[PDB]
Amino acid sequence: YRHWHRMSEDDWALPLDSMPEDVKTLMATPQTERGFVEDYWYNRIRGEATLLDPEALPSKSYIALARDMGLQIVDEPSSHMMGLIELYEYLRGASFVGPFGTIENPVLVPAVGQERVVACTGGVGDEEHFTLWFRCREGFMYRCGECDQIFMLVRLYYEDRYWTQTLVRDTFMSDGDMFDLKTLERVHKMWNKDEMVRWEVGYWAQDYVLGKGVLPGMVEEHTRVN
Amino acid sequence: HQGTKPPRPVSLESRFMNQRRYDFTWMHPQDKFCSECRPVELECKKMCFDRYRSMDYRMYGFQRPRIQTYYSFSTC
Amino acid sequence: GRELPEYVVLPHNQQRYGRDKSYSYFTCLWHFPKMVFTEKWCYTNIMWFVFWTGFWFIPNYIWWERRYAYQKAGFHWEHTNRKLQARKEALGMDKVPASGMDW
Amino acid sequence: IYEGQTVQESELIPQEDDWVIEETNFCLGRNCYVRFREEDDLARRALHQMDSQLNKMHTRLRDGTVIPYMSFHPDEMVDRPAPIHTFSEKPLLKWTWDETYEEAYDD
Amino acid sequence: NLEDHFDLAEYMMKMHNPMSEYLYWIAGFVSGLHGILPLLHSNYYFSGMFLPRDNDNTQLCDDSW
Amino acid sequence: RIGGPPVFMQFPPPPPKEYLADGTPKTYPLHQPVFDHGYTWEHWYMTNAGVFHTVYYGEFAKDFPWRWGFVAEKPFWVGAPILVLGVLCLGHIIQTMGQIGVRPKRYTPEWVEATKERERAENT
Amino acid sequence: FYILVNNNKRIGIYYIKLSIIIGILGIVLSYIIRVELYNSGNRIIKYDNVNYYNMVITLHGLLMIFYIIMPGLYGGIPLYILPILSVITDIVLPRINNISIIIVLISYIVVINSIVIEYNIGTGWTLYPPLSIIGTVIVNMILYGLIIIGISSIISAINFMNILIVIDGIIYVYIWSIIITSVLLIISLPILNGILLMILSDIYFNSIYFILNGDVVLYQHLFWYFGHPEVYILILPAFGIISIILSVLNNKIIFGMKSMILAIIMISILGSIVWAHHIYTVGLELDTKIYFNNLTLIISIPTGNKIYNWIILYIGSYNILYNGYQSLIFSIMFIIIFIIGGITGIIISIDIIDIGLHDTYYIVSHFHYILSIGAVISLLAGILLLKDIIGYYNVIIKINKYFGLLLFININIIFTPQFIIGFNVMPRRILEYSDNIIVWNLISSIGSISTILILLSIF
Amino acid sequence: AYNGGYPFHYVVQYDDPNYDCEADFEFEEIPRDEFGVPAHIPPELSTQIRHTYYVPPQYYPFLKKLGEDTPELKPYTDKLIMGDMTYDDYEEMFYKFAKPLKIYRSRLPLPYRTDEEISQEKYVNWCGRWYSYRQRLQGDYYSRHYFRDWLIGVMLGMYLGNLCVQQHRQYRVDMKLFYLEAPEHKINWVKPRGDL
Numbered sequence A: 001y002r003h004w005h006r007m008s009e010d011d012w013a014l015p016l017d018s019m020p021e022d023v024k025t026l027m028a029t030p031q032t033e034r035g036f037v038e039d040y041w042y043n044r045i046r047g048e049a050t051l052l053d054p055e056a057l058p059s060k061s062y063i064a065l066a067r068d069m070g071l072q073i074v075d076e077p078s079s080h081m082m083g084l085i086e087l088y089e090y091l092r093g094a095s096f097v098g099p100f101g102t103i104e105n106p107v108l109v110p111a112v113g114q115e116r117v118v119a120c121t122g123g124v125g126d127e128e129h130f131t132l133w134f135r136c137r138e139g140f141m142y143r144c145g146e147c148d149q150i151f152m153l154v155r156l157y158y159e160d161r162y163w164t165q166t167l168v169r170d171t172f173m174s175d176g177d178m179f180d181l182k183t184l185e186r187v188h189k190m191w192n193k194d195e196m197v198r199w200e201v202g203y204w205a206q207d208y209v210l211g212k213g214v215l216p217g218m219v220e221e222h223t224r225v226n
Numbered sequence B: 001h002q003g004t005k006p007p008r009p010v011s012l013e014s015r016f017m018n019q020r021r022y023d024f025t026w027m028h029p030q031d032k033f034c035s036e037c038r039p040v041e042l043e044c045k046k047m048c049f050d051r052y053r054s055m056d057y058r059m060y061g062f063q064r065p066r067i068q069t070y071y072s073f074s075t076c
Numbered sequence C: 001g002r003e004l005p006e007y008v009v010l011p012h013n014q015q016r017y018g019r020d021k022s023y024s025y026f027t028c029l030w031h032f033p034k035m036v037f038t039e040k041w042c043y044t045n046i047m048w049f050v051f052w053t054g055f056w057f058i059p060n061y062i063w064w065e066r067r068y069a070y071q072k073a074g075f076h077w078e079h080t081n082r083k084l085q086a087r088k089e090a091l092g093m094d095k096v097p098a099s100g101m102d103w
Numbered sequence D: 001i002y003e004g005q006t007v008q009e010s011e012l013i014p015q016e017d018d019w020v021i022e023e024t025n026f027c028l029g030r031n032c033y034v035r036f037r038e039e040d041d042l043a044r045r046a047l048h049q050m051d052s053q054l055n056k057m058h059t060r061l062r063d064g065t066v067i068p069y070m071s072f073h074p075d076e077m078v079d080r081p082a083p084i085h086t087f088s089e090k091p092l093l094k095w096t097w098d099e100t101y102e103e104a105y106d107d
Numbered sequence E: 001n002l003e004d005h006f007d008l009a010e011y012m013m014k015m016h017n018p019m020s021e022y023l024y025w026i027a028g029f030v031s032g033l034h035g036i037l038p039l040l041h042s043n044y045y046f047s048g049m050f051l052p053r054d055n056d057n058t059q060l061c062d063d064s065w
Numbered sequence F: 001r002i003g004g005p006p007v008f009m010q011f012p013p014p015p016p017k018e019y020l021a022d023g024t025p026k027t028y029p030l031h032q033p034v035f036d037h038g039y040t041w042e043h044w045y046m047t048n049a050g051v052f053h054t055v056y057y058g059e060f061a062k063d064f065p066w067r068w069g070f071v072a073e074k075p076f077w078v079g080a081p082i083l084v085l086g087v088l089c090l091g092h093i094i095q096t097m098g099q100i101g102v103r104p105k106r107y108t109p110e111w112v113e114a115t116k117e118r119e120r121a122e123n124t
Numbered sequence G: 001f002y003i004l005v006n007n008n009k010r011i012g013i014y015y016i017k018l019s020i021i022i023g024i025l026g027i028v029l030s031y032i033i034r035v036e037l038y039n040s041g042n043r044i045i046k047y048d049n050v051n052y053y054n055m056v057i058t059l060h061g062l063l064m065i066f067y068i069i070m071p072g073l074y075g076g077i078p079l080y081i082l083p084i085l086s087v088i089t090d091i092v093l094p095r096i097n098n099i100s101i102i103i104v105l106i107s108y109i110v111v112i113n114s115i116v117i118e119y120n121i122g123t124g125w126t127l128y129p130p131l132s133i134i135g136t137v138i139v140n141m142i143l144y145g146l147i148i149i150g151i152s153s154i155i156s157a158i159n160f161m162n163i164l165i166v167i168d169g170i171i172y173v174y175i176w177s178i179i180i181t182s183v184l185l186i187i188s189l190p191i192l193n194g195i196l197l198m199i200l201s202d203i204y205f206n207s208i209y210f211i212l213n214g215d216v217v218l219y220q221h222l223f224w225y226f227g228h229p230e231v232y233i234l235i236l237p238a239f240g241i242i243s244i245i246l247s248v249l250n251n252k253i254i255f256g257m258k259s260m261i262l263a264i265i266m267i268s269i270l271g272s273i274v275w276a277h278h279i280y281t282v283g284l285e286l287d288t289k290i291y292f293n294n295l296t297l298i299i300s301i302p303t304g305n306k307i308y309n310w311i312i313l314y315i316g317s318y319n320i321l322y323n324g325y326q327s328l329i330f331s332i333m334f335i336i337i338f339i340i341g342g343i344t345g346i347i348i349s350i351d352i353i354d355i356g357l358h359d360t361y362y363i364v365s366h367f368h369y370i371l372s373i374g375a376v377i378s379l380l381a382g383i384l385l386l387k388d389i390i391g392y393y394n395v396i397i398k399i400n401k402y403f404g405l406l407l408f409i410n411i412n413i414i415f416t417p418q419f420i421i422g423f424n425v426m427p428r429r430i431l432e433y434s435d436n437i438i439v440w441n442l443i444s445s446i447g448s449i450s451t452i453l454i455l456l457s458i459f
Numbered sequence H: 001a002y003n004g005g006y007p008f009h010y011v012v013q014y015d016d017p018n019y020d021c022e023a024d025f026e027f028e029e030i031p032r033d034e035f036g037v038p039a040h041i042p043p044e045l046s047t048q049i050r051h052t053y054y055v056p057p058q059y060y061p062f063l064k065k066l067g068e069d070t071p072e073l074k075p076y077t078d079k080l081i082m083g084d085m086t087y088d089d090y091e092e093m094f095y096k097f098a099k100p101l102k103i104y105r106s107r108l109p110l111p112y113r114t115d116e117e118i119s120q121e122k123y124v125n126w127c128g129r130w131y132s133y134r135q136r137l138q139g140d141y142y143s144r145h146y147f148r149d150w151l152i153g154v155m156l157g158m159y160l161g162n163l164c165v166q167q168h169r170q171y172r173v174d175m176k177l178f179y180l181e182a183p184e185h186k187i188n189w190v191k192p193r194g195d196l
């Protein structure tokens, strides 16, 4: 959005030193129990394990492929929530302009709390009036006293929580078959051999499953000076 | 050029020249050194420092000939 | 995560606080001095402020008084000059070496 | 200059011959200084003050919609007295235009 | 917290200690004294009286008092 | 922005209520006095409650000290005129206390005549 | 905390609180002046202590202008509502806002301390040289206060200008009023600082700008190049308040919003180019005098448009609404009072009329009707409108018809007679006067004591 | 078209596996870009050279499956298989298949209103139109009344002003007769007082 500042380096990828060292437990943790860093590396390890196995991709369904990469198959419930989330974020630093509100289609006023201050400017052209500010509280269909424009408050609330991308992913995504560490090892040997590492994440991940320091050059990789 | 700046005529004290309402002390509010001399009037201060030295009070400057010091820019 | 009860019964049975009593226009004239001289928190804060303000006023006062007396006696060079005339009188010499220098 | 919303004669035609202008009182009620209970502590007096806000009041019309307390300026939209942090969620000034895009509709 | 919602919550909820008000009025009273006390001091310094007697700088009748 | 200052947070529940040992609810200081006097008038005023609403604001005599209850009970045009004159009279009285018996010589009849002579000579 | 707070609304309260405190000293000085002027003779100041009177009038003017009305109308109400009107969480520069109020207090302490410790002499609030530069150290202290005050004013102006970058709603007329005052400060203050530094140079650095062959009239140009913009920096915030009160209380949308805004912009530009109407009697060139007189009379046009737009706001309002609220009465009283002050301003604008009326009490009454009556009442009306939002209590003002009537009557008793003595004529900045001017001076003095008594009834 | 063409974030490669741009202070190593172009080959020249993505051939069957399931995606996948997909081609593919999130109004809970209240919607709209009709007409009526009244003020201010015109008129007549006829005017009357 225009109100956001510049992408960080982390916005693209995370450093491999932030990979959890207990990979064996990481790949067995349920999604609802994974933190932001743990969830990043669960998806990256599992997603790259399937993508770096070309011979199996054509026989893998889009439902299974999306699960491996950690992408959520969309549906009307989740689409509604995500859309209203992105609309809330956009309105943080953007103007609020849209069609005239009526009983059939009230002006939708997203909010996290139970109230949001709103102003009615009336219709277009000569039907526009001076700003009339009012407090839009949930559970009431508001009508402007001047132009009769109907307003309504929409709350991004779900089960004692507000709506977030993390909440939407946890509520609607279902964990599939438990990730098999044999796949990690098999793909690791595929792209990492004879001092050539073409899957750096899988070389670090396999090292942790082995106990940290087992694979060649990994003790030297983990030895820091400050 | 500044190191060998030519002498200029002594200014005649004209109708509106050298007017003073009080002594020059803004540089030394408490010590009040050279109250009669102006802030960067080097020749007045030299003679004033000489009086203080003759009164057993040490002051710094205005004692070495220019041609006997480094960085003077006044040597032939 | 902390667990608290809905209510607590206090050990004492004193109703110390409540609504203000009806006050007149000049009620402050006696209530305010009463607080100053009878409420501990008020007169301990006053004494603390007065004591420490005066405490640090003394050393500054002593330094300035000596300085002020000196400045009235004359300029720095007038003081050194008086000690130079005295040294010239003690020795009976019209011209003596400057301080820190030999003959 | 603003002279109210434009009305077409068709919109002034009643659906019954007995329709008159609804006589709903827009006086919110009788008020005075907010009166706190002595028993209430600082926290509970704060709740009391938050429940006496006129700008949270409205008038419900015959069709169930409510006309809220409205003001020309947003100064009357914060709690009285003003809290330390007022507009946490950015107040939304709604502008109206005739532009539309197809994605919003479904056939 | 509910106590922190309102700025100056104790005063707004009518629980503040009255001493705060007394200090504010005292501060104003001291400010006022800065115009009266130097008047009295300056009058005495240059005349010997804290305040004049109306028209005592002009010629007065014998019975004037 | 994950982990930034939340847009909205719910208030935590208020601290436990305090009772006295006998069960009486503990009362806290309250600066809303019930002034003692014989006045019981109640004045109501229609007030702006935004753009489309009003509120009937009432002022009760017991909410005010005796001096205001007394003054606010009377008709405005009975009190106002008397008060205006009274304040003016008091001001003059205050300003006359410091000049009781002061008799400058320039206001005596002799000096008054001499000024008339000067005006005649100068055609003032 | 108390001093550390950065909350913009708390700081707004501090500005009003400090203005009332410093205001007590201001009013006391005014009472001294009026008491002295009650008759001819010496009343409360000895003939050997006449220098004190000169100091009283000087400090009265300086404090009321820079430490009371300006901190109240440009620092108090603005810091409390402007960020709300702009639908923004808080002021753009939080830390700068805190230091500004602290600076004002520190400069006030310096001034009052200089009363107590330094010899008491005066040179007017306009600090004309050479008199200002041949005085004692109290003049040096006052200069430090003004320069320090200037720092607070400029940084506060920078703070308000930044609202344009963050405003999330519509720039209402009031917001426009503050922004333009901020612009007027950014352009006028740097010139004031320069001339004040030159006063210091002559006082403290043996400079010779204000001795023969140096033009003393130079100071008056640079001073008044800030002076007159200052009088509009003090009135424009009041105009912004009046607009909000009339629209809100009458439930009527502002009429000619863009003309109101463009009238404020116009007043500022014109107010930046008319300063020499304060220098009519010095002996300026005929064409200069005619230019300044012409442009000074033009300022009435934009100022007149605003007045008439206010009148139609009150016209036609519903009768059922109670009209005795103190805020509404004060707002209406402002229109009635400001017209008197402005019209007399146009009279003095004619230079030939000004020859007779310069340095007379007619000028006093003129700027009192606008400031001592109009600006004060506007600040009171604005605070009164925000009583619920601010939350103060323990006063009987909101509905007090006695206070409004007594104030209006008695304030006019003070300054209406000062117009009369302007054609008598009684010079300004004097304490003794001829016996034939006692009547009017006495009437005004009775008015001053009475107004003070009415200030006690609010509590 | 932003930041002068300099990407905010970009990849750099180094030939020496143990090279550190912050610890070492050698002067022989030349950094490369994301495509591998050495830094000594200027951007203007390297950006003209055509770089295409080469995936291992074992991926061709997968890229073929994607094209068949989504025919609109086939031309991009074919370019990738044939090693003809540049970075720009990839970007076009990426943004072509991005879709906006959808909001469904049918899923929004509504403020509670009884069936009796819902049947009165037309009546309330009818009242609102009549209120707007009455408002608009009253504006014309009031504007005419009050602006006409302001004329009474003009006439009252013209009468009161004319009173002072008449006083001024008589004043000037009187002044013209002072030096001509008034006995108050005296000449050869005032004598110098002299120094006291």
Ligand SMILES: CCCCCCCCCCCCCCCCCC(=O)OC[C@H](COP(=O)([O-])OCC(O)COP(=O)([O-])OC[C@@H](COC(=O)CCCCCCCCCCCCCCCCC)OC(=O)CCCCCCCCCCCCCCCCC)OC(=O)CCCCCCCCCCCCCCCCC
Pocket: C036, C041, C042, C043, C045, C046, E008, E009, E010, E011, E016, E017, E019, E020, E021, E022, E023, E024, E025, E026, E027, E028, E029, E030, G002, G013, G016, G017, G020, G021, G023, G024, G383, G390, G392, G393, G394, G395, G397, G455, G458, G459
């Ligand atoms: C123009 C006038 C008329 C106007 C009329 C129109 C008005 C319209 C309405 C205007 C409304 C504006 C908006 C109002 C918003 C109010 C918000 C508010 O209340 O905020 C909460 C705020 C604080 O409440 P809080 O949140 O509970 O604060 C808790 C504390 O933070 C923490 O509590 P704490 O107890 O811990 O506090 C610490 C406390 C601790 O205090 C103590 O311990 C005090 C102990 C007792 C001391 C008492 C004083 C003793 C004096 C002795 C003097 C001796 C002289 C001897 C002379 C001998 C001669 C021979 O204090 C200190 O330690 C520091 C105190 C420093 C300040 C006081 C300074 C006094 C003057 C000093 C002068 C020094 C001169 C030196 C010169 C040296 C030269 C060399 O309220 C106040 O501060 C009080 C405000 C009260 C007035 C509000 C407005 C009411 C409406 C207007 C009424 C009319 C007023 C007229 C002006 C005054 C006339 C006099």
Ligand code: HEA
Pocket: G126, G231, G232, G234, G235, G277, G278, G296, G297, G299, G300, G301, G303, G304, G305, G307, G338, G339, G341, G342, G343, G345, G346, G348, G349, G350, G354, G357, G358, G359, G363, G367, G370, G371
């Ligand atoms: C906020 C305060 C304020 C305000 C608004 C004004 C406004 C004006 N002032 Fe000012 N003035 C002062 C404060 C103020 N003044 C002070 C403090 C001094 C003395 C400083 C000192 O000397 O120490 C001073 C001094 C002063 C003098 C100096 C006289 C002298 O030194 O002898 C003059 C003369 O030009 C002047 C003129 C004006 C004019 C022409 C206006 C105009 O703004 C007035 C405009 C308003 C109207 C004209 C009325 C409303 C308009 C209409 C009703 C439209 C119809 C009217 C007409 C068509 C005319 N002022």
Ligand code: HEA
Pocket: G016, G019, G020, G023, G026, G027, G030, G031, G033, G034, G057, G058, G060, G061, G062, G064, G065, G068, G069, G072, G124, G125, G126, G364, G368, G371, G372, G373, G375, G376, G379, G380, G411, G414, G428, G429, G430, G431, G448, G451, G452
């Ligand atoms: C805005 C500034 C201001 C204000 C309010 C006043 C108010 C008053 N002034 Fe003013 N006065 C000046 C600014 C002001 N004056 C200036 C600039 C000069 C010229 C200085 C000079 O000559 O060098 C001057 C000169 C001046 C003189 C001339 C003395 C002389 O030079 O010979 C006299 C006495 O005749 C006088 C009297 C009064 C009186 C009786 C009041 C008032 O007391 C009348 C009664 C009104 C009140 C008592 C209410 C005031 C209340 C507040 C100000 C607080 C407001 C705060 C809030 C609302 C939060 N003033």
Ligand SMILES: [O-][O-]
Pocket: G227, G228, G231
């Ligand atoms: O000053 O007008």
Ligand SMILES: [Cu+2]
Pocket: G227, G228, G231, G274, G275, G277, G278
């Ligand atoms: Cu002016």
Ligand SMILES: [K+]
Pocket: G036, G037, G038, G039, G040, G041, G042, G043, G431, G432, G433
């Ligand atoms: K007198």
Ligand SMILES: [Zn+2]
Pocket: A120, A121, A122, A123, A129, A132, A144, A145, A146, A147, A148, A149
């Ligand atoms: Zn509307």
